[PDB]
Amino acid sequence: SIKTTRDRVPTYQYNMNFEKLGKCIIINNKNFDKVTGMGVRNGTDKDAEALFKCFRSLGFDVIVYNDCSCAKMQDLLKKASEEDHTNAACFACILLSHGEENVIYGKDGVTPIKDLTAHFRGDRCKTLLEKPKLFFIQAARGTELDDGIQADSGPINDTDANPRYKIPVEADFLFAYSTVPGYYSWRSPGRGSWFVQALCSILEEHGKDLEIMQILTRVNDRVARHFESQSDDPHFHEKKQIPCVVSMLTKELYFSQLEHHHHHH
Amino acid sequence: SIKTTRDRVPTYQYNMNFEKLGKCIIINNKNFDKVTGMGVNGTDKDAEALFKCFRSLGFDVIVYNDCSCAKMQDLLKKASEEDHTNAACFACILLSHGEENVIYGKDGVTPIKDLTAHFRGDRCKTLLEKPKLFFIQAARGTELDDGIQADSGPINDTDANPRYKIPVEADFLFAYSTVPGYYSWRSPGRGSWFVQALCSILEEHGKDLEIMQILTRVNDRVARHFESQSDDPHFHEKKQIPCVVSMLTKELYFSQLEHHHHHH
Fold it and tell me: Shortest CA distance to B140 belongs to which of B201, B81, B181?
């Protein structure tokens, strides 16, 4: 049919009618131990700060945790799952650190995303069932030492035997991964990552009128446009990156209910 | 408040003004070589439903059957070698046995990362900035085990990290489904839930809903097949759900943008 706008709409959206939108954990890891070999994540602060203001505006009970250790990160995530979200619309976790294969970097070493998400896997955490659990991740690979002076180094193979490369496809889970780096500066003043900046800019302008997928998509195109334009300075170009969205959502996500938000004096 | 000019067209949709909607390759694998240890039912119904569905959607569908890994890898490549300039988008549906980051051909297994890689921008420039949809139905294969009484039942894994199974590039969209077929006791194949869901929801809203909307509805549709139909905490169907990976940079609508350009 043509031009059809007259119907109840709808039972196709996640229910937001709750005392609170939900909690938003923001793990902002900028400094990693030497035993790690990872460099300082500049701008991660700008990011985190931007994410804080942004998600807070959406109505998230956000808390920022910095330089968390694998044990710490795992700890708080498990604690959050431990809580009662009966009067919450959803949950959101944001990770800002170095990224490898299926794992995020902690203050000390590396911890698999699988674990962080485990705490909510199906059965666990019944108070969040039927509700979205959002994971926004920004974990690019390390900048390394870039060759330079030849030093003494050697990889060691000895762990507590606990491989976790699965990140199970559970319902009502959404992931917005980003491997797009950002540190092409001399003094490294930190101007924030493209992804974060996009995710924030767009979110704090359509986070109340657009559905999650719409936003995330615009963020994608936004970040995309960066690899379609110049990067200044000759022979200084980078390989194209693009955020990734994995959605196991079963409804439309809207950080609103009805009407608009009051901003008038 | 950050920008006040109002330029929303909204030019946030993939331009569908083309001669054709695009090609839709359907690889329907139903029979495999015994060496693969893989079994044969219901896929033909799925293929038929898809072909019809995507056809009425406007696609130019082509159905392949019982393909080898070479053939699967081959035809997909040639396809990226064609000129898609007159096409709005591209679609490929794979129906076969699944394993980790690999899909089964008739004679073996081949990584889906290779099947799709063929359309990466710098390999298929005629589809640059154009949606490349990949719908996949590849549940893990197995034989119906039921006889001697045991204290343990079936066991599986949920290993699925879309990175080594997707060529993370702009305008790529994947809808994986590892849900089996079940009903392998006496009742014939009725088609996978995912496929039926997709087609069904596509018939009714294929030209009025945005792809993610459609796909999300399919997720829920498929998900509802695990309400709470059980008696004792032991004999129950393992809850499963399809996974949607999007690298799309615009909203995808299978219809044509009507008369616009009119705002004050």
Answer: B181
